[PDB]
């Protein structure tokens, strides 16, 4: 109970961060595509 409960929260928090990071990388690349368009 004690250790396992800790570990699962840490795992969920890590997965939530990786999910946010992935979303933000895609956002960056989409802005970059826009910028390419504006410079075309």
């Amino acid at each position: 109970d004690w250790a396992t409960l800790s570990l699962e929260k840490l795992l969920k928090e890590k997965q939530a961060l990786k999910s946010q990071i992935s979303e933000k990388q895609r956002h960056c690349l989409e802005l970059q595509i826009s910028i390419v368009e504006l410079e075309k």
Partner: protein, 43 residues
Amino acid sequence: SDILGMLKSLHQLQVENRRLEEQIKNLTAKKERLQLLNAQLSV
């Protein structure tokens, strides 16, 4: 288990997350600047 090592890595993710939100902010400003300048130069 290596909870210290895990907290470290989780912190590295948190930093990276803030670094990315900062990148989004600069790119967004770059984009909007270019949008304005293009319009300004079209009249």
